[PDB]
Nucleic acid binder design. Sequence first.
RNA 1: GUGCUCGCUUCGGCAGCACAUAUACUAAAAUUGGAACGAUACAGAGAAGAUUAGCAUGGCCCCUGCGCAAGGAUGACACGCAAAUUCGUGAAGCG
RNA 2: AAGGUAUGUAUCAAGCUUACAAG
Lengths: 130, 55, 286, 16, 253, 41
Amino acid sequence: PTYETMFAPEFGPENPFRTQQMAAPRNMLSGYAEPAHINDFMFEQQRRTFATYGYALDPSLDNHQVSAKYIGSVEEAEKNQGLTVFETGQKKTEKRKKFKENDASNIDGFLGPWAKYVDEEEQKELDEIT
Amino acid sequence: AKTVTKQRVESHFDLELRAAVMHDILDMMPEGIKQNKARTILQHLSEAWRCWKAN
Amino acid sequence: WEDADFPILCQTCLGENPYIRMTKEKYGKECKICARPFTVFRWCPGVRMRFKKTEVCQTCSKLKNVCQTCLLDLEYGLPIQVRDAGLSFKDDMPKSDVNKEYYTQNMEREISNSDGTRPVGMLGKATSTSDMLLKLARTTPYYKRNRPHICSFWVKGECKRGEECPYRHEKPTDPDDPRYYGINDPVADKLLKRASTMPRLDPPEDKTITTLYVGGLGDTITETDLRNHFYQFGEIRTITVVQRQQCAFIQFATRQAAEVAAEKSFNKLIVNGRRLNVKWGRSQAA
Amino acid sequence: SNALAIQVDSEGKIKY
Amino acid sequence: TDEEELNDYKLRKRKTFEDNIRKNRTVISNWIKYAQWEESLKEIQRARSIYERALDVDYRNITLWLKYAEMEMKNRQVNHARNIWDRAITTLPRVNQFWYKYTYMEEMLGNVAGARQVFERWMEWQPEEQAWHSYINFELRYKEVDRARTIYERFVLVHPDVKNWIKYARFEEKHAYFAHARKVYERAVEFFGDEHMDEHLYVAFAKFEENQKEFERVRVIYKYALDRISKQDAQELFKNYTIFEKKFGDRRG
Amino acid sequence: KGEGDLSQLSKQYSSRDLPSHTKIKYRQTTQDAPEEVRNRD
RNA sequence: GUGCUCGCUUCGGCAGCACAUAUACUAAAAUUGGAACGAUACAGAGAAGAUUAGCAUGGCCCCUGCGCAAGGAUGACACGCAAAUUCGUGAAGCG
RNA sequence: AAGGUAUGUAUCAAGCUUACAAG
Ligand SMILES: [Mg+2]
Ligand SMILES: [Mg+2]
Ligand SMILES: [Zn+2]
Ligand SMILES: [Zn+2]
Ligand SMILES: [Zn+2]
């Protein structure tokens, strides 16, 4: 196999008779679906990074042929300067103090991890809808 | 499908005998337009058997 | 009766995460049209969102080029009869239980076993598109599709879960405006929305505006392009290509054909890849 | 279209 | 409730006919009577469906094909009737009626090279006499010197009938074709029955050459007589040969 | 892709379809095994 | 949250380590289509006289049964299409 | 255990079924 064979472009006016979606490559009726063998842990880490903080690195192979950015909402990534969820962060801010009873001696007073937190007109419309 | 147990032995021999004589007359008659007035060779067959039992 | 490997799934149903984890059964639920046992898939789109499993089989999605769970067009993100009226052909399918129903689904599956790539009959008329549907193809979709549906016991004010009620609260739905072809309730309002856009007012005279200030020629429109796009309309009385402003001036004899040009070009005549510039001419000896 | 697609080979007679 | 009784009539007859076809899927009387019952409704896209799924059960009967095609041809849907005639004749080649009715349909339309193409496809399967001289009759009724010449030399290779040998001698009796008509007589004289003649070729060849002058007419009945059949002829015609040669010439004293 | 009832569509594990005689006797060497047929007169 | 390490200077403040993303989310439903049985009223009962044993065949009809038994009124449901014989019409071809 | 107290229709709920797609 040679690079010049597969990298050779296609002659033509690109056939703009079709729509954008039907001219686009596929194997499955919705996009070219193909297997993969990513590391489990870094998949889960950057997944949880996006799921919490709304940014992650982008997965690709041949989008621009160079892709090294972040995605989602961009500016909050550099607000935290690219930290993760498994890191003891630079500050301990907006924490929320629970009250603990971990003796197992008092009864109806022991709340271990089950501790409920220290924090603890529409019905006219609801009756007229029902 | 269902086997041929002892209660449908006699009701299966007639079935396969008249299937065999059906696609024997279907492949034996020449290129005439009608085959057997849709059933009549079979009527002659059963009449032949009734005349056999009655001699 | 049916296995699968990966679902159809328009983009608004996947959610905002490029990294989603999704689970599959082997014969899951049934299709909600044809009762066929597909392979139900489930995932989490977003962190404030319900799971949105999988609603119809791969066969009943390949019939009408429809996504897998929200039942919208895979090319646009539009309902079904919007597409079929906007392509003026229905691609019929029966209504009853057997009467030609599972018969035609079975046979159209049997003649879809080869490709698995494109819809069965829509492939010929999904090319001649992008004129009447592209004006309403809402990209950057709203994710209110994925939000979890409204709980009871906030409706009755009883919900002991407090904050951790996963579903929603304080969204009382309204009992005035909420299958597969027709008829669907918000679609009538959406076709009234497309039939009743915001044009320029039609001025009180008798069709004197046969001239029009169409411009933004740049280097895209040429003289023979616009006068052969108007020659199918009909005959000119005077053309010019005034290139100081990159504009073109055409009229019609007895206006009517150029009338549909006024209907074709309210920032709408898209040839040569440009949103053309249109405002109203004189027709006033000025 | 409504009708089929008509095919004849490059050299010979009408293909059916 | 006229709509109710009308749709009741239609639904009861449809339910009757669907149960009748569902009982016996082999006797095709049910499909043709049900399909022409919907044809009596005079505006249909479902009697097409009844025939087009009525040949899934038995495509090998001619009655269903010719009745569906005469239905589609009875109405103005000409393109569909042609579009099922071609699959009828490619599916069932050896039945003559489909070729005949499809040629006849295109005769009632224009005489386009479509019709000639239908005919030459019909020639290609090597049929009997009945079809071949029907196609030469088609070429004569559009007055073709060229094309009835073209399609009738490929004739004789397959039917060497003496009735057809003497009617490849036809450019004489329509065009007179002088030198190449004599060549047609050469082609007649050299082939089979070299010493046995099939006792009939030279009767008609003598009739034309007696209709011709005394060019070379003495030879074939009397002096090319090596090729006899035990008496050169029966008793029925040799005195008739003599008075056949007597009184149609220069008559020298 | 969705076969008949024997494949996946039924749990009817009928008797007479129970793994009987689940190995095949091949004709061994003292009988007319096909290696001793490839040359015999 | 936790526990451990003075690890960096106050037991307190901090730093590091170990631990790493559950849930057909509901107690609901504005909910949903509602078929079976029972009631109601009809229809009513194979084989050319009457009473009748049955066993089959066909599939878009099922029930009971562990059923490649068996029974469900022979489980039900199964009907007038004559064809070729006379004659009219029309076509193709020939003399 | 079946083999006997028939089955076949037309209106009227719980049993069972998803708690979904949705401007
Ligand atoms: Mg029975
Ligand atoms: Mg029984
Ligand atoms: Zn489906
Ligand atoms: Zn969707
Ligand atoms: Zn709640």
